[PDB]
Amino acid sequence: MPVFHTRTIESILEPVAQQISHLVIMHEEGEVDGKAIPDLTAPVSAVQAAVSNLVRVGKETVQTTEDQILKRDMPPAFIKVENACTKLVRAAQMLQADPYSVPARDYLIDGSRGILSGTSDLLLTFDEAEVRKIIRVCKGILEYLTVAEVVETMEDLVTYTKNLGPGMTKMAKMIDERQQELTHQEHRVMLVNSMNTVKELLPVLISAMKIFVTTKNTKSQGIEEALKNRNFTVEKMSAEINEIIRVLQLTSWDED
Amino acid sequence: DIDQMFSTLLGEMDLLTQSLGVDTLY
Numbered sequence: 001m002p003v004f005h006t007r008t009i010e011s012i013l014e015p016v017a018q019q020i021s022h023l024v025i026m027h028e029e030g031e032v033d034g035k036a037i038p039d040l041t042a043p044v045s046a047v048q049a050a051v052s053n054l055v056r057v058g059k060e061t062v063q064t065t066e067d068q069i070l071k072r073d074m075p076p077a078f079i080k081v082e083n084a085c086t087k088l089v090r091a092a093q094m095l096q097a098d099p100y101s102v103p104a105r106d107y108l109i110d111g112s113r114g115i116l117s118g119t120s121d122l123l124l125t126f127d128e129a130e131v132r133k134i135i136r137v138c139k140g141i142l143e144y145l146t147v148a149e150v151v152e153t154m155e156d157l158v159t160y161t162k163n164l165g166p167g168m169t170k171m172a173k174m175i176d177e178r179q180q181e182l183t184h185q186e187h188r189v190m191l192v193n194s195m196n197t198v199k200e201l202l203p204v205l206i207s208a209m210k211i212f213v214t215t216k217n218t219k220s221q222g223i224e225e226a227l228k229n230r231n232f233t234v235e236k237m238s239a240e241i242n243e244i245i246r247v248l249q250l251t252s253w254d255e256d
Numbered sequence: 257d258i259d260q261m262f263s264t265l266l267g268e269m270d271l272l273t274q275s276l277g278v279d280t281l282y
Binding site: 013015016022032037038040046047050051054057061088108112115116119123126 | 257258261262263264265266267268269270271272273275276277278279282
C-alpha cells in the first residue's frame, strides 16, 4: 500500500488504514472471525450519515468551483464512497439476521476499503486542485519575467519592481507551505533548492535591469553586456520555476 | 465545513472498527 502524498492526508487516513488492516488480520484468523458479531446497525448508520454529509459538501464544491478538472474528478469519488457504504449497510442487515454470516464479514472489509479508497481519491483530487493554483501563480511569474526584456527606462523599472516584488513573495510563501506538507523528502529538497535559487537571483535581476537601463539612457558603452546578464538571469530563474512546476506535480513510485 | 466532514467520517469509521473489537477486544 502507497505512502500518502501530504502530511495532511496522511494524518487523516493513516489511523483508518491502520484499523482496517487490523480488521483484515482478524478476519483472516479463523477462531476470532468465527465469533458472533453484535449488531452494527447503529455504527454503520452513523458512517452512512457521515458519508451523506461528506457528499453534500462535496457537491457544493462541484457546483461552485472554477476548476473544471475538479468538477470532472470529484463525482467518481462520491460514487465510490457511497457504493462502499451500501456494502456496510448490507453487512449490518445480514449480521442482524445471522451474527455468523460469512458474506457480511467480506462486505465489512470491502466496504471499509472502499471508503478508505474513495476518501483517498477525494483528498487527492482536492490536493491536485491546490497544486494547480500554485502552478498558476508560478506561470504568471514566468510570463512577467518575459516582460523584463522591454523595460527601457528607470520609470518602467520601478513599476516592474513594484509588481514582481509581491508576486514573488506570494509564490515563495506558497512553495514554502507546500514543501512542508510533502511526505517525500527528496521533493521537499528540490522545491527548497529551486525556490532559494529564485529568491537569490531576484535582486540580481533588478540590478542587471538597472545597469541596462542606466547604460541605455546614459548612451554608454557595453549595453550589449548588460543585456547578457539580464537575459541570463531571466533564463535561469525561468528554468528554475519550470523545475518547481515539474516537481509540484511529481508523485513517486511508492504512491502508484 | 469540508475538513470537518472528513474528520467526522473517519471518526465514525474509527468507532465502527472499534465495534468490531479492532483496538478494544482484539
